[PDB]
């Protein structure tokens, strides 16, 4: 399977979660947020961290994550309407997934687009070493603004 990450790092350590929290985790744990398509990763960053295209950092790297289709995937419990406005619930669900270390990936719904699935990546899981990563450079024919 193919996953995509947009960040300042060409690795999958996710060590920033030890300091900072997200929508699907509370700080104190390594975690990587990823999407199923390059625009999926870009749209989340631009909307949720409020970056205009002219301000898109030169430090960002589009990282292509290659994983075997046989990789372990956890599952979310059913979410009732209004879940996107309940940070305490979404952070708790991700915390338990990461702490239990049951599977490498956890698919989560997108809060912006319907029929769009994002992914949580647990680096502490043993199957994390099976990832093949590659940076896809932004070129004059493939960049915002």
């Amino acid at each position: 399977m193919i996953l995509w990450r947009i960040s300042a790092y060409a690795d999958l350590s996710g060590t920033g979660g030890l300091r900072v929290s997200g929508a699907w985790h509370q700080a104190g744990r390594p975690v990587v947020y990823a999407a199923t398509s390059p625009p999926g990763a870009m749209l989340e960053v631009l909307v949720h961290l409020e970056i205009d295209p002219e301000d898109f950092p030169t430090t960002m790297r589009l990282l292509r994550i290659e994983l075997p289709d046989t990789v372990s995937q956890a599952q979310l419990p059913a979410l009732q309407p209004g879940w996107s406005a309940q940070p305490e619930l979404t952070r708790t669900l991700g915390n338990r997934f990461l702490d239990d270390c049951s599977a490498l990936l956890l698919p989560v719904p997108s809060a912006i687009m319907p029929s769009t699935t994002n992914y949580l990546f647990n680096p502490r899981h043993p199957q994390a070493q099976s990832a093949k990563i590659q940076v896809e450079d932004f070129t004059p024919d493939s960049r915002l603004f």
């Binding site: 990450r5 947009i6 960040s7 300042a8 790092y9 996710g14 060590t15 920033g16 979660g17 030890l18 300091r19 900072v20 929290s21 997200g22 929508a23 699907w24 990587v32 947020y33 990763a41 989340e44 960053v45 909307v47 949720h48 961290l49 409020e50 970056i51 205009d52 002219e54 301000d55 898109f56 950092p57 030169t58 430090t59 997108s110 809060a111 912006i112 994002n118």
Partner: protein
């Protein structure tokens, strides 16, 4: 700080821009940074930083009023500790944004633009309180790690 923001690029870039903004040596420890704030920065730093465009005159007046600032310069007094702290907050957030964004232009524009997370306030406007400064710090760190859902 220097773990989440990695040493190879981030923290050195953060400390290097901080050294250009406030003359704080890169190898100075955290307590030595605190001592420099309590010791009081030179009032001539405020004028130089606005000339460079790091902060606006309206923001410079938030740190210290203009007639107080010119009185500090003429008598050659250092800024008070809280005047120095408010100046450090702006330089601290600026240097971190320039490390995360990589360009001074992109960093300043992002810091000068309203945010729905802050109910229409800009990141620079949230530096009035240290709790608001933390909120800008984490948002900058969320950009570096890609924690945007």
């Amino acid at each position: 700080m220097l773990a989440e923001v990695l040493r190879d690029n981030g923290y050195h870039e953060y400390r290097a821009r901080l050294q250009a903004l406030l003359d704080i040596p890169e190898l100075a420890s955290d307590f030595e940074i605190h001592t420099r704030i309590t010791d009081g920065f030179a009032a001539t730093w405020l004028v130089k930083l606005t000339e460079r465009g790091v902060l606006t005159p309206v923001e410079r007046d938030q740190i210290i009023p203009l007639r107080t600032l010119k009185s500090r310069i003429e008598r050659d007094q250092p800024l008070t500790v809280d005047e120095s702290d408010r100046l450090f907050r702006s330089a601290h957030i600026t240097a971190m944004a320039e490390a995360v964004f990589g360009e001074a232009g992109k960093a300043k524009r992002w810091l000068s633009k309203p945010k729905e997370r802050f109910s229409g306030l800009t990141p620079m406007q949230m530096l009035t309180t240290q709790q608001g400064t933390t909120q800008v710090e984490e948002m900058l760190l969320q950009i570096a790690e890609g924690y945007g859902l």
